[PDB]
Design a protein around this ligand. Structure first.
Ligand SMILES: N[C@@H](CC(=O)O)C(=O)O
Ligand SMILES: N[C@@H](CC(=O)O)C(=O)O
Lengths: 232, 231
């Protein structure tokens, strides 16, 4: 199998499902006590998230490109970035590191494509929902259109991610609020919902979503597994 | 903070508690969204575990020393090996890698020392329970003596580790069996119980142990946090 290189810590809470599912994927395919060959660089999320709010995206591109290059030298054979928001600077990583870069939005777009859907709801950080870097790739490469919540809903969705989810707090109040937003986008004709923040899956089980769930972290991890074994 | 280097995936299920507890310790200490600087090398445990059964210990020493050296060169400032059994080959890592090596038995010995205890039960793989490499360090460095289960109990304890715990299977029958062994070693005057396999705490909650619990993984993670920020 190939050694996968993970850029994690963003937050570390959502790096864990990546680690778990990549190992469970290898066990499923290889059987026995086999586990995945993983190199993980977990960053201090404080610096990353600070740059997000300052708009210092070039600085985060440096941080992540350096991290990927260090994993390359350690033997990583592909790069997985464990965060939807930071694919805003995926170009920097793909440009400065020659390793194959498994873009989260490609794995998500193939999953939605496989379910035959072109109009889906999108939850994530305010950056991922409101800007073009994520939604524009889904549109240009898969002809997939995203519906996002209203402004007041986006601010609270974003607040929960950073003030609760990334600190390990999963409240039923926030869980029920996310379910409520999903249900409103369902009435706009959304066919599925992207959990487009890697932590949302930690808060919202699939039976709380009135609509079929695309969990970016699960989907990304399965794409990692398929790369490590040269499958799918 | 110093970036920590983890040698994990032995098994990956016990690597997760390390990653969680190290991050939580950094958060508690720096506050806010601060997270731990971590480089993890997770190996394929199949090759390691087969080597244990074949007695190919030198081969695992090479694997782990090479892994440690790769992490050092990626920026690792200290090494944490996320497994009790493989400290049998800690000498290979410490001899070939100049980084500070945070020995799991030293972290556990200071915890038992802090509790004022000198006679404890030891649960773990058959290798950790029966051989000298782990218990001999506790004896030499801390004057701590370990009591271990009888032979039939050791075989089933080890059995559960590799056929259930390392596969993510946590059964009540196994949990109850471990609980009965702990209650049995308590009869021999064990003052506490070392969970000397990093997966045992995933199975046995502290409230199922009639003895005070030294969870090796938790203690090791707390020591790593203390190192990373020089406490
Ligand atoms: N990890 C979350 C939050 C973040 O990275 O800002 C995401 O996928 O967007
Ligand atoms: N992780 C277990 C099993 C092993 O690595 O052999 C231990 O601490 O000993």
């Amino acid at each position: 199998m190939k050694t996968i290189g993970l850029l994690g810590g963003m937050s570390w809470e959502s790096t864990i499902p990546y680690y778990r599912l990549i190992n469970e994927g290898i066990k499923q395919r290889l059987g026995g006590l086999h586990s995945a060959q993983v190199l993980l660089h977990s960053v201090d999320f404080h610096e990353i998230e600070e740059c997000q709010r300052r708009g210092e995206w070039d600085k985060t591109g440096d941080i992540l490109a350096e991290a990927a290059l260090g994993l390359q030298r350690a033997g990583a054979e592909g790069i997985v970035l464990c965060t939807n928001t930071m694919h805003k600077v995926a170009d920097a990583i793909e440009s400065r590191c020659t390793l194959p870069f498994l873009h989260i939005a490609d794995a998500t777009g193939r999953a939605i494509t496989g379910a035959g859907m072109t109009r889906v709801a999108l939850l994530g950080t305010r950056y991922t929902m409101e800007q073009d870097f994520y939604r524009g790739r889904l549109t240009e490469q898969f002809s997939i259109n995203c519906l996002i919540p209203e402004a007041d809903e986006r601010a609270k969705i974003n607040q929960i991610i950073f003030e609760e989810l990334c600190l390990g707090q999963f409240t039923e109040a926030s869980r029920a609020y996310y379910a409520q937003v999903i249900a409103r986008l369902a009435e706009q004709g959304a066919q599925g919902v992207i959990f487009g923040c890697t932590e949302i899956g930690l808060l919202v089980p699939e039976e709380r979503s009135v609509l079929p769930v695309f969990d970016t972290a699960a989907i990304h991890a399965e794409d990692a597994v398929a790369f490590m074994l040269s499958l799918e």
